[PDB]
Amino acid sequence: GLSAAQRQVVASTWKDIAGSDNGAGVGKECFTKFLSAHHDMAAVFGFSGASDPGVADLGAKVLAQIGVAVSHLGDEGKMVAEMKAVGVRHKGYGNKHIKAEYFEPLGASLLSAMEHRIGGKMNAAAKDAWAAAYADISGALISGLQS
């Protein structure tokens, strides 16, 4: 759902997470560590492994879309409609068997990459606001994927 305080914490820490590369470095770290930890997930993405060039490319696109979702957080119906559309496109991505269960371990890796970039700015309040935001953003994508 996200409270106004949680929307405000994610909107303000996104400025630091985005940096000067629109979160591309965070995206690269997230998917590289995720695929190094679960080699079994490389086939779901259609990648050869964690060092496939496609990992850094996908990481930049995922984090750029989270930046769009963050700018629309004040209108939930807008944010979920656009994330559902992203989700509908995932029916035809990677192996065409992307499952909802895969999104929760990916969330842990995203939060970790975010904290690695902004350090202490990713305090307990920021981690809770971003876990709440990642739950809504991925939840809406999963809804498009299962539609």
- Interface with ligand HEM by CB under 6 A: which residues? 44-46, 58, 61-62, 65-66, 86, 89-90, 93-94, 98, 102-103, 106, 138, 141
Q: How far apart are the first and last CA of the chain?
A: 21
Q: Least distance from C-beta 120 to ligand HEM, angstroms?
A: 25
| Closer of 9 and 79 to ligand HEM (Cβ) | 79
Structure tokens at 110: 């995203």
Q: Least distance from C-beta 28 to ligand HEM, angstroms?
A: 14
Quick check: 5 and 135 in contact, CB under 8 A?
no
- Three-class DSSP category at 92: helix
Is 97 labeled as ligand-binding? no
| Closer of 6 and 138 to ligand HEM (Cβ) | 138
Q: If phi over 0 gives left and psi between -120 and 50 gives alpha, with beta otherwise, what is residue 19?
A: left
| Closer of 69 and 120 to ligand HEM (Cβ) | 69
DSSP string, 122-135: S-HHHHHHHHHHHH
| Closer of 122 and 140 to ligand HEM (Cβ) | 140
Q: Least distance from C-beta 13 to ligand HEM, angstroms?
A: 17
Other beta carbons within 10 angstroms of residue 48's beta carbon come to 13
Q: Least distance from C-beta 111 to ligand HEM, angstroms?
A: 12
> What sign does the dihedral 49-69-64-11 (CA atoms) show?
negative
Q: Which residues are annotated as a binding site for heme b?
A: 90
Q: Which residues are annotated as a binding site?
A: 90
